[PDB]
């Protein structure tokens, strides 16, 4: 907690004690590797919940899927060793990172036909049964999220390993909606206030009044941001945060911006986003009262790839709010084409 920090912007050296908030969201986010707690507890948690009537699992975070994508070989071994008529198949997932209606639970009485290590070898392929258990994926038709579990895991208190390629995880003892507080941070030092986790880099700055400045997402989760890590979280209206509360937006006054309301219908369906306040290339925004009312966000390029030049806003504030994704440059709700339909 004590060390020396060099700052390029201030051209000075900071030496002392305190807390350093690592970025861990740009430049090859490393590592948050994957291994859960003892396998028998997790293995016993599937068929016990399957007896209740569960059908699938959703991942609250993008990386939680990569837990399953490399562990599914292991559970298939133990359930077959326990002659369980079930199968586990994981797949790809895309925003919005959907959430189920229920969750797993102990039953801490685990299976009595399992080993202890988590790195066993000599994998043997198993068969497929008529009873199939799904994982998060494009399966929104056969089984809805009502019969799907979500937010059933939690980061172990001793599960923090940054150099050791592993992070211990345990299942929660109760149902919850908030995100994992164990790997979570927020800070502010006299010019900037940053809320951060493995996926979010919500950053706010002060020019004349405290306001949001930029944000970066590698995932769009659905767990509510806990108030234990929220700066200036009093008297905040739910209709004014730039990032919606449903998408893990921090309930705070630093999530504010004059002239803009909540972006409940932004292009969040893209997996990655970059929120800032500038102009999309080749576009101009002019303040006028006769521009159309706010609606769904519009991509700056049409279906033919042609660019839309002129735009209008009713009561926005320059520079306009725009998004950087894999699709181009999306404007906010309060920005509409000046003459294009």
């Amino acid at each position, epitope marked *: 907690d004590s060390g020396c920090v060099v700052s390029w912007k201030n051209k000075e050296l900071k030496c002392g004690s305190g807390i350093f908030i690592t970025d861990n969201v740009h430049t090859w986010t490393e590592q948050y590797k994957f291994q859960p707690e003892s396998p028998s507890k997790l293995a016993s948690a599937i068929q016990k919940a399957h007896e209740e009537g569960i059908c699938g699992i959703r991942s609250v975070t993008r990386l939680e899927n990569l837990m399953w994508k490399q562990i599914t070989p292991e559970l298939n071994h133990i359930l077959t060793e326990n002659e369980v008529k079930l199968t586990i198949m994981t797949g790809d997932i895309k925003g919005i990172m959907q959430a189920g209606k229920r969750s797993l639970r102990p039953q801490p009485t685990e299976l009595k036909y399992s080993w202890k290590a988590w790195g066993k070898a000599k994998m043997l392929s198993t068969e497929l049964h008529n009873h199939t258990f799904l994982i998060d994926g494009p399966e929104t038709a056969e089984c809805p999220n009502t019969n799907r579990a979500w937010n059933s895991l939690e980061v172990e208190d001793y599960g923090f390993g940054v150099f050791t390629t592993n992070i211990w995880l345990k299942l929660k003892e109760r149902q919850d909606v908030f995100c994992d507080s164990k790997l979570m941070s927020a800070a502010i030092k006299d010019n900037r206030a940053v809320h951060a986790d493995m996926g979010y880099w919500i950053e706010s700055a002060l020019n004349d009044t405290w306001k949001i400045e930029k944000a970066s997402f590698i995932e769009v989760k659905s767990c509510h941001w806990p108030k234990s890590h929220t700066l200036w979280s009093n008297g905040v209206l739910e209709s004014e945060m730039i990032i919606p509360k449903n998408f893990a937006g921090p309930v705070s006054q630093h999530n504010y911006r004059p002239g803009y309301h909540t972006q409940t219908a932004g292009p969040w369906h893209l997996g990655r986003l970059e929120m800032d306040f500038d102009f999309c*290339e080749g576009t101009t925004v002019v303040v006028t009262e006769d521009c159309g009312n706010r609606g769904p966000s519009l991509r700056t*390029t049409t*279906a*033919s*790839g042609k660019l839309i030049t002129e735009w209008c806003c009713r009561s926005c504030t320059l520079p306009p709010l725009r998004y950087r994704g894999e*699709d*181009g440059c999306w404007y906010g709700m309060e920005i509409r084409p000046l003459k294009e339909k």
Partner: antibody
Amino acid sequence: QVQLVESGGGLVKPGGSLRLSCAASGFTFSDYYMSWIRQAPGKGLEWVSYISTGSSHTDYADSVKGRFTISRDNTKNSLYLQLNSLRDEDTAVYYCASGYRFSYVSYWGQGTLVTVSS
Amino acid sequence: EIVLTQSPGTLSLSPGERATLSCRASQSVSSSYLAWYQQKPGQAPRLLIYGASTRATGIPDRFTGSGSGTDFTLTISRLEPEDFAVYYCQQYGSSPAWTFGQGTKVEI
């Protein structure tokens, strides 16, 4: 009429380099997305790369990351692609097409052919 | 990935008939964003549907695009000897693959 003219294709040694240019006319070049599409002999069409209007997106295909470079010049309505570190499977007919991976393609013109062998 | 599938790989018919195509989709295309391209061997590809339902400019009426959801059919009402070519289907958003369709051969 939208005319797309390209030049630069030819036989080159593996590990060499090449430059492909696209000549646009008959439409607002500085208003549409630009992209390059290749087609292996007797195989299906595959995306290569595309560039934005202000040249700020510049996304590249997975197998050519760091080996290809794409650029445009809106003043003279010219689109450029740079070939570097060419390998054996790069032999394909490269089409200069007015499009974008997240959009349909409106204009195609006489894509050139490049061969990478001895 | 919503990589598409084209069936059948090739089609055999005669002039005067009425042909149909099929571009299977992985799941749930968005806003019916599908297109059809004609590859007359050997020339540059053309554009038929934007659009999945709307004929492109300069295209004869016989080319009809239809289908919705996860199944799409490109149907030519009237056969014609020059129409024998290779047709490709492409989904644009979101998020499209890095390659086009496999194509269907139309043979006499």
